[PDB]
Amino acid sequence: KIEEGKLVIWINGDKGYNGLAEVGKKFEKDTGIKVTVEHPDKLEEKFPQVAATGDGPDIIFWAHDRFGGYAQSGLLAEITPDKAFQDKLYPFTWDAVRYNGKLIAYPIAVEALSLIYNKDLLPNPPKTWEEIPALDKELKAKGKSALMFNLQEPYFTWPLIAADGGYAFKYENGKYDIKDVGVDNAGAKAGLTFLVDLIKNKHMNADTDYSIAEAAFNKGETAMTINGPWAWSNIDTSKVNYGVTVLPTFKGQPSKPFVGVLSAGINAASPNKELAKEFLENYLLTDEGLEAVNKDKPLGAVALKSYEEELAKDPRIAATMENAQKGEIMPNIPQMSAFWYAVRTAVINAASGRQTVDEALKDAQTRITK
Ligand SMILES: O=C[C@H](O)[C@@H](O)[C@H](O[C@H]1O[C@H](CO)[C@@H](O[C@H]2O[C@H](CO)[C@@H](O[C@H]3O[C@H](CO)[C@@H](O)[C@H](O)[C@H]3O)[C@H](O)[C@H]2O)[C@H](O)[C@H]1O)[C@H](O)CO
Numbered sequence: 009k010i011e012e013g014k015l016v017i018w019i020n021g022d023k024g025y026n027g028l029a030e031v032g033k034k035f036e037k038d039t040g041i042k043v044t045v046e047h048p049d050k051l052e053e054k055f056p057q058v059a060a061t062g063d064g065p066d067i068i069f070w071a072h073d074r075f076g077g078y079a080q081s082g083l084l085a086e087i088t089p090d091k092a093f094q095d096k097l098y099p100f101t102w103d104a105v106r107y108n109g110k111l112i113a114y115p116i117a118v119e120a121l122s123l124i125y126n127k128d129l130l131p132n133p134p135k136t137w138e139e140i141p142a143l144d145k146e147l148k149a150k151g152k153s154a155l156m157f158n159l160q161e162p163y164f165t166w167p168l169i170a171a172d173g174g175y176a177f178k179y180e181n182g183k184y185d186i187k188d189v190g191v192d193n194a195g196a197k198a199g200l201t202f203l204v205d206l207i208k209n210k211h212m213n214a215d216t217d218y219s220i221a222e223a224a225f226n227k228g229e230t231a232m233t234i235n236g237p238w239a240w241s242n243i244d245t246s247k248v249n250y251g252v253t254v255l256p257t258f259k260g261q262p263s264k265p266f267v268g269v270l271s272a273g274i275n276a277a278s279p280n281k282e283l284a285k286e287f288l289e290n291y292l293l294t295d296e297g298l299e300a301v302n303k304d305k306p307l308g309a310v311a312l313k314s315y316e317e318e319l320a321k322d323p324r325i326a327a328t329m330e331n332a333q334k335g336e337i338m339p340n341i342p343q344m345s346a347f348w349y350a351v352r353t354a355v356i357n358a359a360s361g362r363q364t365v366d367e368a369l370k371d372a373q374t375r376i377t378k
Pocket residue numbers: 022071073160161162163164218236238268348349352
């Protein structure tokens with residue numbers, strides 16, 4: 009069982025756990041309640057294990073898409089923020105933490121892919137996907153290329169694919185309609201076709217992955233790349249003069265990158281649920297709390313309006329939220345796994361010539377709504 013009278017918190021080792029510990033120190037100063045932050049290896053794999061036996065931390069931090077699985081096994085307690093507190097956060101973030109109509113976690117940070125560009129090679133980045141082919145041609149005559157990004161993960165290619173109307177699962181009836189999938193529609197076919205053509209016309213290479221694209225941009229060889237806030241650190245170290253902006257539009261429609269919300273859930277087996285609520289709502293989710301964590305390790309964009317408004321003073325952060333609001337919250341339902349694998353395959357096959365674009369998406373669609 010979990011010990012009563014204190015709070016044990018789990019957050020990944022790449023996050024600002026030292027800053028989080030300081031908020032916990034503040035909590036102890038004001039309430040006398042001790043807080044312990046830990047960052048065990050593969051914590052998101054261990055949580056389901058220990059939580060199933062009534063053990064584990066009182067609070068766990070992780071991207072919201074993993075919380076669907078946890079809530080499915082009843083591992084997270086339903087949270088009770090009132091209307092007033094909910095209005096302190098951007099409305100769309102609350103949707104990322106709702107399962108069977110119930111709120112099961114507190115939104116902390118918000119992330120989404122953005123268009124990253126080299127200001128020295130490209131002071132005026134393209135506002136549309138359509139003008140990249142021509143831009144690539146003129147940059148080649150200069151010894152450089154226009155764009156390079158990870159094409160191995162559907163998470164990275166979806167922004168373009170979904171731009172003109174694509175979606176994973178329709179969300180209206182309170183939750184997701186698992187039979188209403190948008191990977192087979194005209195918009196997706198159009199998006200995936202433009203993507204495949206960029207490869208066929210040699211503006212991109214079907215084999216490019218995360219490391220290949222990162223190295224290219226951080227060396228100054230390609231003018232643009234598509235990545236998230238987690239990649240800025242490496243770019244900073246490379247000293248390339250870069251900027252972060254809204255993703256290019258396609259067919260006049262904005263790219264729709266998936267959105268991941270770092271969230272804080274409360275262990276269903278915790279005997280300290282009220283303490284957890286007090287800490288999360290009135291200590292962490294305040295300008296002072298997030299500041300303490302952010303100073304340790306940047307959170308990127310955040311769900312708390314007041315603090316995000318301050319952070320948006322950084323154009324890279326402002327662009328991150330801009331792209332997020334034009335994006336699609338990652339579905340937390342069990343069916344999303346089937347979507348990831350089917351779409352990953354469709355892209356690989358359409359780019360290798362194993363299947364035409366239409367046939368690749370047609371099969372992915374059928375496999376998902378299976
Ligand atoms: O520095 C931390 C940072 O989060 C990195 O870990 C970074 O994460 C980002 O990019 C991921 C994509 O590479 C995002 O993952 C989501 O999308 C993928 C789909 O591409 C999902 O993966 C699922 O599908 C694949 C098949 O393609 C399968 O192998 C996986 O098992 C299955 O889960 C993820 O589940 C989504 O979360 C992530 O949100 C984002 O932060 C990169 O991972 C660094 O390479």
